[PDB]
Amino acid sequence: WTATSGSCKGRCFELQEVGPPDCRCDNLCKSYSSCCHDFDELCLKTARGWECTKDRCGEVRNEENACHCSEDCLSRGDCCTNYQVVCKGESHWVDDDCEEIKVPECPAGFVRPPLIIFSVDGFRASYMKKGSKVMPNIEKLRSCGTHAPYMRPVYPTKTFPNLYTLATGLYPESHGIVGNSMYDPVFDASFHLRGREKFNHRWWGGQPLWITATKQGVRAGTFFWSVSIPHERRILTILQWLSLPDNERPSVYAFYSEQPDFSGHKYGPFGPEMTNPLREIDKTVGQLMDGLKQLRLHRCVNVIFVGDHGMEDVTCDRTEFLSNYLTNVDDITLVPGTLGRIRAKSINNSKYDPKTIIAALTCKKPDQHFKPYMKQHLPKRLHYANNRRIEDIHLLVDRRWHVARKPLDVYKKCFFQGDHGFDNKVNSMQTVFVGYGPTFKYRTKVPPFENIELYNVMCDLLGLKPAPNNGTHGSLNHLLRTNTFRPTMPDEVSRPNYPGIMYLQSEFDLGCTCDDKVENKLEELNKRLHTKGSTKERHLLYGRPAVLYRTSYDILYHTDFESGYSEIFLMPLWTSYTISKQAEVSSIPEHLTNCVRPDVRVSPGFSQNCLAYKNDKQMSYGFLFPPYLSSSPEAKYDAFLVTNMVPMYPAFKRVWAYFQRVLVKKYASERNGVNVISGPIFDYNYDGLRDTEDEIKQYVEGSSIPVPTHYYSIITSCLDFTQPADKCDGPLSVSSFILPHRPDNDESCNSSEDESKWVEELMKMHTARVRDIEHLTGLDFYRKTSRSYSEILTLKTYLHTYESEI
Ligand SMILES: *[C@@H]1O[C@H](CO)[C@@H](O[C@@H]2O[C@H](CO)[C@@H](O[C@@H]3O[C@H](CO[C@H]4O[C@H](CO)[C@@H](O)[C@H](O[C@H]5O[C@H](CO)[C@@H](O)[C@H](O)[C@@H]5O[C@H]5O[C@H](CO)[C@@H](O)[C@H](O)[C@@H]5O)[C@@H]4O)[C@@H](O)[C@H](O[C@H]4O[C@H](CO)[C@@H](O)[C@H](O)[C@@H]4O[C@H]4O[C@H](CO)[C@@H](O)[C@H](O)[C@@H]4O)[C@@H]3O)[C@H](O)[C@H]2NC(C)=O)[C@H](O)[C@H]1NC(C)=O
Ligand SMILES: Cc1ccc([C@]2(C)NC(=O)N(Cc3ccc(Cl)c(Cc4ccc(Cl)cc4)c3)C2=O)cc1
Ligand SMILES: [Ca+2]
Ligand SMILES: [Cl-]
Ligand SMILES: [K+]
Ligand code: NA
Ligand SMILES: [Zn+2]
Incomplete structure (x- = not known):
């Protein structure tokens, strides 16, 4: 129960989450159905839209407006992002030439350049080239900053495992978010995209960036956004937090976009309907960069533009059914789709045999589009086994395909043309990385790297000591103009012995034989040198x-x-x-x-x-x-x-x-x-x-x-x-x-x-x-x-x- 009749007056997008049943005004209140009665009216204003027009320039402040064009807006920190362009003859950030940012150029009172993470769902690596004509703001970040041709996500290449890997530097097996859906036997509980169970903290292991920062005295904006908060309002809220007094202002911020993933599912990765979502994401980047330039922060903030995974073509007709392979299909539960995870329907069943299930799924049809594994036999590079939430039986699904239990599951759920979740080495699953700012290099391309490495760099960007994680700290130093981390080689713990000839042949009774008794200071001096390390170099x-x-x-x-x-x-x-x-x-x-x-x-x-x-x-x-x-x-x-x-x-x-x-x-x-x-x-x-x-x-x-x-x-x-x-x-x-x-x-x-x-x-x-x-x-x-x-x-x-x- 929430006594939702408290008020959000002077509290909109407050940074501390208030303790129930006091009502909430934070950027997640909507998701918990727990906002104060006036949250929409006060905090989600929309009147007059998101852009200044010529006729609003130097208007009289009207607190009803979504954003302002009145003379006082800059000092209040709540101008529309295009205020200066429309009302002061300023140019958009995207129209200015890029100029190397050798040092942070920050307003007085900034102890360190802020970091803004702009994360985009389903942003496939090839969109950078293929969509370059319709993404001018993104293209400028990319060519002026530091960029990789692609960034490798983690397996499974789903949304929650990857975003939480971005936040923690941990493999899903260690952070515990091992899929978009999960069952945990020790809790005896389930986790789903829809629903309230995902809000319980017991699923979320490791230590994400916002907690690392807080513990070390660096203040953090909220990383999660309620889905119905529009993108323009997310941007304006970040810009507002950036105008707070020095003692209150966060140093790290995240923006999250549901696009292009939402549309990619519907239309496939390259559907003609994909152009507009890419245009719209670029426009949001433009709003941020114009807003930053207005606050004189565009040469002060480090911006990371990062995807969670790509998007592949996948339709209904490319579905393999376990019912075409198994006879006991009703004795199993399948987590279905672009990967498979199989467990027993009931643990009060001693007739259930993993061995027999595997054998019935192995090389059964000539063109089989999945491959069963006991999880411990999966490629080690996937690091997908050491968690009680990962079922013992796994199915690696071919790119472009789905696995399902029975046909009824598919036509009683064609809808989708895109999906993701496949092996994290598959090209279509690769995603993007651009870093732009004083701490990143200028016009620099770096080789592709794994998203597990970014947590360390984000900690470096903020002067934080990272929690223990799976990145290799220092492996991304070449991304940075100045590093505060300088890795050292681990010390050898055991020194070796160098044995010489110490045993006679007859002391061995190993049951071995060799025809080598078919057996001179040239060749005998030689072989002694070899046995002493003469050829070692x-x-x-x-x-x-x-x-x-x-x-x-x-x-x-x-x-x-x-x-x-x-x-x-x-x-x-x-x-x-x-x-x-x-x-x-x-x-x-x-x-x-x-x-x-x-x-x-x-x-x-x-x-x-x-x-x-x-x-x-x-x-x-x-x-x-x-x-x-x-x-x-x-x-x-x-x-x-x-x-x-x-x-x-x-x-x-x-x-x-x-x-x-x-x-x-x-x-x-x-x-x-x-x-x-x-x-x-x-x-x-x-x-x-x-x-x-x-x-x-x-x-x-x-x-x-x-x-x-x-x-x-x-x-x-x-x-x-x-x-x-x-x-x-x-x-x-x-x-x-x-x-x-x-x-x-x-x-x-x-x-x-x-x-x-x-x-x-x-x-x-x-x-x-x-x-x-x-x-x-x-x-x-x-x-x-x-x-x-x-x-x-x-x-x-x-x-x-x-x-x-x-
Ligand atoms: C990727 O990076 C990560 C992070 O560096 C690496 O993971 C670490 O590996 C360490 C070694 O395996 C491990 O250290 C152990 O931690 C135990 C205490 O752990 C708790 O506290 C930490 C710190 O705050 C916390 O992070 C842990 O979080 C895990 O568990 C919680 C709650 O269950 C989850 O929410 C969370 O997601 C995470 O789960 C993951 O790890 C556990 C294992 O810890 C797995 O079971 C899960 O599947 C999942 O992957 C914990 O809350 C500590 O008690 C251990 O100590 C035992 O072993 C040592 C060996 O030196 C011994 O000296 C001790 O005496 C002790 O033995 C006793 O317990 C035994 C087992 O119960 C028993 O058999 C004995 O007889 C004794 O009684 C141990 O030190 C560290 O916790 C994790 N950290 C994380 C975040 O995962 C990972 O290895 C890297 N991967 C690769 C490929 O390099
Ligand atoms: C428990 C919970 C609450 C609310 C929600 C909401 C509405 N549902 C949803 O899908 N998102 C996006 C989302 C997903 C996962 C994570 Cl970890 C992050 C943080 C993050 C952002 C950027 C980076 Cl780079 C890293 C982490 C954001 C939500 O906020 C998801 C989950
Ligand atoms: Ca081991
Ligand atoms: Cl999943
Ligand atoms: K043998
Ligand atoms: Na074989
Ligand atoms: Zn998706």
Whole structure:
């Protein structure tokens, strides 16, 4: 109950939310049905519209008007945004040439340049070029300020997960807004776009920018706007808050537009009906910039123009129905649309089987337009698993399609031509970023980046210390003319051992055999130098990775590769090697097919053993440095060391061997040499973070050899591919992946064919940032390069997406 018969007189768009049942006058009162009786009359004035006309110039103030053209309006802070243009011969902001803003040019009393976030729903990245003719204000922000060709949203590319990611720097799995709709089993409660449950604070985790600011003594405008408040009134309210006395004036503001998303759903991303919404958004930007110029703030405020996600063509007829696949369709609940999330209709049902549901949905029709996953098997780059609100069964839906439970759900809800929510690497889901102001660079284009990074920059823009988040602070320094943050490399926690020859062959009883007893100060001086690190500068191009947790491990040198070998996990944490453009692929000789050799540098007690693999009927093994790439028949014996061995399912060896035999060489010839770092990943609790030893759920049968959940590789070369990878004078180029270590290839529907038809497709799907691998391994890469650390941080956040040119 609200005693809604208090009053909004002198309180319109108050910044503090008043405690019930006292009635409210804040920009969200409408949404809670709790405004004071006179809210509309006082706070939502509309009389005479939004623009001064010649005949209103220097009029007598009439408090009924929506905005004013009377002489006193500037000092009152409530002129129409075009007041000066109409009544003072001023030009619109968009008609003035741009001039570099080297320093903030602010009125006295401003302690720091304000930040205004202008967020636009459904603003697809290609609108910047495709709509440029009808968006002159936006085009000026873009070309005069700092801009990316696009900005990557988070998965799912829905509105609430992305806006809240913008506010917090957190993946949806950590902030908790994991979809536009959700069920939470611990609360036993549901969350929807419509309704009042979304207003409960228990859904909203992390610490959003407005709370970070408040806690640190920086005042914040309200980020949320009730939908019925028109855009012109949102702009005028921001401009009014900017005229408050210094002790009352917020330093950060957000504007939100429902467009172009609202229209995009109805007409598709490029419908002819899309021109007008783009025109109208541009006009709103113009109102803001004219209003800022009137208050002498247009060279003082930092403005961010940012989308939450793009928009794809999607219609009714492109719907897959689970009823065409399942027989128990009524025993499941589906969260439907551009992604699928499946749970049991009833938890008092012990007959419900996730395994059988998955099998009924896997590769069942030739043209199938979705792919089922247990959430822990989703590409690691989506970071979409570690939340009790994300159902165990997930469906990744093809771009342009929907999934639904039954046809009745679709024709008893054609309406829509546009939608979004798909995989966040899909081109049509990409959105926009422009930063304009004293703190941003002038006329600068930066490479595409992920929206998880902006929270850190917005904190920097406001002199705030960010709460812990998923951005990599410093990776966006190149956006800024002056940074207050200067990242430093994390300290190594564990220093390695460098073992020499310490064991005799006969101390090993590992059940291994090798035909290598088929066995001179030329060649024997040589091999000792190699085992001491003589070739290390060739295979470790960027220094050794630093181990950032407490553990026991050895550096092992070899002619063709170096490794950091874990005495705890009984395998390398990383193996590093360089393949020049000219390298030769050879095969594994017949006499070496089953060869595994004890490593006399490493004790029996810290080694794997061949018997365990013989005994484990499911588990086979592979090698991290590939034998196919040995530099010589003699160096090839090094690749069969028991310290280069890792556990692999036979189904996985098909993937791995094709990568090592075919694709490494192809990348080296295309990229003019590559450096490769490969290794295992253990993430049994799917939290995106390295597992401790006591978290491992599977061992090779009868042994202490832990089974990886994933294998990664990081492939580095010179950005200027006219220089060889091992002699690169400038910026680096990287692509990486985190392949799931699975006992079957069900994920690839073409897997019964030759690896050349399906393997590379799988690796592309599981593309990763070096930063994802860092979290997953507790390692820190690129510690010794000639590049600046900020540039290295940008490099580690890069994602190679394999999409074509937007
Ligand atoms: C992306 O960035 C984020 C932010 O940096 C990273 O997430 C962090 O990861 C940390 C390590 O996993 C984690 O630290 C833990 O926090 C526990 C206290 O957490 C509460 O307080 C914080 C601080 O205010 C708050 O932010 C938390 O918020 C979570 O939970 C609330 C309420 O449930 C949600 O509203 C909110 O959205 C958020 O949920 C997310 O995180 C939880 C896990 O915390 C997940 O379950 C959810 O799915 C969701 O993702 C909390 O309110 C703290 O108690 C933990 O301590 C245990 O473990 C340590 C290990 O050192 C040990 O020393 C302790 O003794 C303790 O062990 C005891 O508890 C165990 C488990 O109950 C038990 O088994 C033991 O036997 C012991 O009893 C732990 O330190 C941090 O909270 C989150 N922060 C956030 C915001 O998510 C994330 O890792 C990054 N992602 C990647 C890929 O890098
Ligand atoms: C609980 C609640 C209350 C009201 C509402 C309203 C009316 N419904 C709705 O869709 N919006 C927009 C909206 C959506 C999500 C978030 Cl987080 C933000 C904040 C924000 C803005 C910009 C940036 Cl860059 C980041 C965050 C704004 C509302 O305000 C949504 C949700
Ligand atoms: Ca983990
Ligand atoms: Cl959703
Ligand atoms: K086996
Ligand atoms: Na298959
Ligand atoms: Zn939408």
